[PDB]
């Protein structure tokens, strides 16, 4: 059988973050263990996050490992009016 992928061997953990209206969150701030993922792993939001109004915004972080395998994490970006 084949050697497993990076995704098979890693488990990124989602993290909620809070931002103010208008701010642009970074996908890195929605992952709680990025140091434990392989060097060279990238993280991105699947879709840009809406921060034009307050609310709990669901988002997905796509975690792409150097071998091309991927994990997703479902997270929440909380937008508040300051
Ligand atoms: Na995984």
Author numbering: 225 to 306
Please give the exact wording used by the authors of the publication that reports this structure:
Proteins attached to the surface of group A and group B streptococcal human pathogens that contain tandemly arrayed Rib domains have been associated with invasive infections and proposed as potential vaccine candidates. Here, we study Rib domains from Rib, R28, and from a surface protein from Lactobacillus acidophilus. Together, these 5 structures of homologous Rib domains, and further sequence analyses, show Rib is an example of domain atrophy, a rare event in domain structural evolution involving the loss of core secondary structure elements, and also reveal the remarkable structural malleability of this domain family. The structure, molecular dynamics simulations, and small angle X-ray scattering of a Rib domain pair suggest tandemly arrayed domains are likely to form an elongated rod on the bacterial cell surface, thus suggesting a possible mechanism of immune evasion mediated through domain number variation.
Structures of single Rib domains with ∼38% sequence identity were solved: RibR (S. agalactiae Rib; amino acids 230 to 308) and R28N (S. pyogenes R28; amino acids 230 to 307). The structure of RibR was determined by experimental phasing and refined at 1.7 Å resolution; the domain fold has a cuboidal structure consisting of a mixed 310/β fold comprising a 4-stranded β-sheet curved around 3 short 310-helices, with N and C termini pointing in opposite directions along the long axis of the anisometric fold. Analysis of the Guinier regions of both plots gives radius of gyration (Rg) values of 14.7 Å and 26.5 Å, and distance distribution [P(r)] functions determine maximum particle dimensions (Dmax) of 57 Å and 97 Å for RibR and Rib2R, respectively. These calculated Dmax values are consistent with our structural models (56 Å, RibR; 98 Å, Rib2R). RibR displays a Porod exponent of 1.8, consistent with a rod-like particle tending toward a “flat disk”-like shape. In the atrophy of the Ig-like RibL, a significant loss of the structure (∼20% compared to RibR/RibS) is involved, but the domains remain thermostable with melting temperatures (Tms) of 78 °C and 88 °C for RibL and RibS, respectively, and 71 °C for RibR. The Rib (RibR) structure revealed that the original Pfam analysis successfully predicted the C-terminal residues of the domain, but the N terminus of the HMM needed to be extended by ∼11 amino acids. This has been adjusted within the Pfam database, which now also includes new families representing the RibL and aRib domain.
